[PDB]
Amino acid sequence: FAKKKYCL
Amino acid sequence: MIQRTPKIQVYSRHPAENGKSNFLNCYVSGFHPSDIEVDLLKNGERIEKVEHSDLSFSKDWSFYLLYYTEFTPTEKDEYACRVNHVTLSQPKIVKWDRDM
Amino acid sequence: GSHSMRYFDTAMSRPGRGEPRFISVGYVDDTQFVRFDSDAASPREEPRAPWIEQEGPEYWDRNTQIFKTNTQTDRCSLRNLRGYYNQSEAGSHTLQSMYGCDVGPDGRLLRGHNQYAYDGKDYIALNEDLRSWTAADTAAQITQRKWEAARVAEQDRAYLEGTCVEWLRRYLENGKDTLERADPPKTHVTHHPISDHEATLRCWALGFYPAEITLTWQRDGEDQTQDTELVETRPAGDRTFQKWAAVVVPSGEEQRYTCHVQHEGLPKPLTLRWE
């Protein structure tokens, strides 16, 4: 199940 | 940036038997950045419709890809993998040797 | 045994050739179960493991939404990173990510992971505590301050300890005939004369899963680490892996060399010799 990413 | 030269292995899925259907694999690994050109050759000519795996990488961040095609080896036919990458000045050819 | 779930994501800019490509591939151990590529022409046709199809269409919908949002987020990241290194608009750059969980044979969390690399260099990592960051340089310190201010680690922790563990346990159950089956290596030793004086002994391991294996030569029961050619473990294309290890031996001394094989699918480790 994929994870929401956050902008670097 | 960093550049890492690909490692290349050429080998069959199953133990090679002259006249028996099999898969010819070219495994490129340890490379960076990800752009790479891979051909499978039969008697020096490009094989068409060669498939490849989805781009992934090792936990050291180096990319890997498997290129593969169905083939029926014979005593006389020559197979190889031809690889180009930014780190290579000329394309690198690795011959299929059923003992490696 | 123990298991892992990991996503490997690559974002690659390509000025003058459209927006950066984003590809995310998810694995249980050495089995890929999902792929999302922003350059795929038919998202609906992108491969999914069978033990995934069983979860139905709302699962697919939720994962597709996250991958689509991740595409945009990794493009935002690449724009910011070009700025943090004062880089020109002309070059191609790469952002990689790995995230996921390791669990034990009981399905308990061993640890989680969420880390990044930029142009091949480690950039930032979530620490084992799942609360704090390690930044490789003054660029990654910007990301760290941003992520500290926004409490991002708390979101990643909730995913790693909750969603990731819970879904890895559900995939292992649904896929138990494959994911929980270790296939031992098929092993033999070959002999390749190099001259009158010496030959290569090559110890082969074929058809094994998962990929982790130990393959070593001993001379008179001493490890031959320096004198052994060990090739990278390689995929066969049928889910299984292959490896070999070779040593050069003097003519007539072959019986002093033993090959040793450790693998999870073996009931006991192997010792092999030529012939």
Residue numbers in the entry:
A (entry chain C): 2 to 9
B (entry chain B): 0 to 99
C (entry chain A): 1 to 275
Authors' account:
Antigen presentation by major histocompatibility class I (MHC I) molecules is central to adaptive immunity. MHC I molecules bind peptides in a groove that is lined with discrete pockets (A to F). The stability of MHC class I molecules is highly dependent on interaction with a bound peptide ligand.
The 8mer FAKKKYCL and FVKKKYCL control peptides were also synthesized. Comparisons of FA and FV 20mers with their corresponding FA (pink) and FV (green) 8mers show that 8mer peptides adopt nearly identical bound conformations and that P1 is the most divergent position in both 20/8mer pairs, with shifts in Cα-atom of 3.13-Å for FAs and 1.42-Å for FVs. MHC I peptide ligands are usually 8 to 10 amino acids long and bind with their N-terminal amino group pointing down in the A pocket, as seen in the FA and FV 8mer structures. In contrast, the canonical structures of FA and FV 8mers showed very similar networks of interactions and exhibited identical Tm values, 71.1 °C for FA 8mer and 71.4 °C for FV 8mer. Finally, it is worth noting that there are two water molecules in pocket A of the 8mer structures. These water molecules form a network of hydrogen bonds with MHC I residues in pocket A, including Tyr59, that anchor the peptide N-terminal amino group. Results show that FA and FV 8mers have symmetric distributions centered around 90°, indicating that the two aromatic rings are essentially perpendicular to each other. The simulations revealed that 1. interaction between P1 and Tyr59 is characterized by the more stable T-shaped π-π configuration in FA and FV 8mer complexes relative to FA and FV 20mer complexes, which is consistent with residues 54-59 being ordered in the 8mer structures but disordered in the 20mer structures; and 2.
